[PDB]
């Protein structure tokens, strides 16, 4: 959805930019590496970093909108369990939660 979702789209399109957008590091958990992944909080960090909102909170909400649409895929836990049907907020402003775009993500190999 690049022609729809007025706002998110554009925003997302940016997130793709590894320079003018969100970064991409390799995080771990237990015993699993995750390449081309982000962070629940980080995702918002880029938002605040660029000043997409007034505070982290705002981002927390927006973030959801991003994830919801499917611009951010859950990887690991929490985020998933959330997307499942936790509350009215699928996103989790936590450094533990991790997300990735449906195109890159942790490439097998």
Curated annotation (Swiss-Prot):
Residues 18-103 form the DEP domain. It comes from Mus musculus. This is Pleckstrin. Major protein kinase C substrate of platelets. The chain holds residues 126 to 221 of 350 of the full protein.
């Amino acid at each position: 959805g690049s022609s729809g979702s007025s706002g998110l789209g554009a925003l997302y399109l940016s997130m793709k930019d590894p320079e003018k957008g969100i970064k991409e590091l390799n995080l771990e958990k237990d015993k699993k590496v995750f390449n081309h992944c982000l962070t629940g909080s980080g995702v918002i960090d880029w938002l605040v970093s660029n000043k997409l909102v007034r505070n982290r909170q705002e981002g927390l909400m927006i973030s959801a909108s991003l994830l919801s649409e499917g611009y951010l895929q859950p990887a690991g836990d929490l985020s998933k369990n959330a997307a499942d049907g936790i509350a009215e907020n699928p996103f989790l402003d936590s450094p533990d939660a991790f997300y990735y775009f449906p195109d890159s993500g942790p490439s097998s190999g």
